[PDB]
């Protein structure tokens, strides 16, 4: 039993809700919140910009130190950093950005990072400003993640479409 409330159950291990991941994180304080990161951990917009803003830029300060030490992530890769006031940990995961020409096949590799954590709160990778089809992202999530994932979908219209079209 966990503290996630109001989710629709899609499969044995995947749950979905129309919610703002920022507000959901602040309420649940999950062990792991997933960020829709880029390889530079520059959290300017989309989910990343929103999460970083909620940490009062502490996420960005920590991220800049991480990059200065380690260099950029790989597309499809991840790193674990602090969750600040939102969660114990933040798993920064880089899905391919279609608006940069990146290989959509890397989306499965991106979701594989979730399997290193028993329970996560997460957005749909590569959705939103990353330019991928959120319906496809949900399919890859369901077919790749085996741990317990709670998906927050900000747009109510998109949420309804994701539920109504789910096979």
Contact footprint for ligand A1BKC (CB under 6 A): 20-22, 36, 46-47, 50, 123-124, 127-129, 152-155, 158
CA distances from 147 to 69, 102, 121 (A): 30, 26, 11
Q: In what order do the strands lie in the sheet with 89-93?
A: 8-9, 14-18, 148-153, 119-122, 32-36, 89-93, 78-82
Q: How far apart are CA 90 and CA 122, in angstroms?
A: 10
Q: How far is the CB of 137 from ligand A1BKC (least distance, A)?
A: 9
Q: How far is the CB of 79 from ligand A1BKC (least distance, A)?
A: 19
Q: How far is the CB of 47 from ligand A1BKC (least distance, A)?
A: 5
Choice between 70 and 94, CB closer to ligand A1BKC: 94
Choice between 8 and 158, CB closer to ligand A1BKC: 158
Choice between 65 and 120, CB closer to ligand A1BKC: 120
How many beta carbons lie within 10 A of that of residue 22, not counting itself?
19
Choice between 34 and 79, CB closer to ligand A1BKC: 34
Which helix (H) or strand (E) element contains residue 73?
Answer: none
Q: Cα 149 to chain center, whole Å? A: 10
According to DSSP, the residues that pair with 80 across neighbouring strands are 91
Q: How far is the CB of 123 from ligand A1BKC (least distance, A)?
A: 4
Choice between 70 and 165, CB closer to ligand A1BKC: 165
Q: How far is the CB of 35 from ligand A1BKC (least distance, A)?
A: 11
């Amino acid at each position: 039993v966990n503290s996630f409330s109001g989710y629709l159950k899609l499969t044995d291990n995947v749950y979905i809700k129309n919610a703002d991941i920022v507000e959901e994180a602040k309420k649940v304080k999950p062990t792991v919140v997933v960020n829709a990161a880029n390889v530079y951990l520059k959290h300017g917009g989309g989910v990343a910009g929103a999460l970083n803003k909620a940490t009062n830029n502490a996420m960005q300060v920590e991220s800049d130190d991480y990059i200065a030490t380690n260099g950029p992530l790989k597309v499809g890769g991840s790193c674990v950093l602090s969750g600040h006031n939102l969660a114990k940990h933040c798993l920064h995961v880089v899905g391919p950005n279609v608006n940069k020409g990146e290989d959509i096949q890397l989306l499965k590799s991106a979701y594989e990072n979730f399997n290193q954590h028993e329970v996560l709160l997460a957005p749909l990778l590569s959705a939103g400003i990353f330019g991928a089809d959120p319906i496809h992202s949900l399919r890859v999530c369901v077919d790749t993640v085996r741990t317990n994932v709670y998906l927050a979908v900000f747009d109510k219209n998109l949420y309804d479409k994701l539920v109504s079209s789910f096979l």
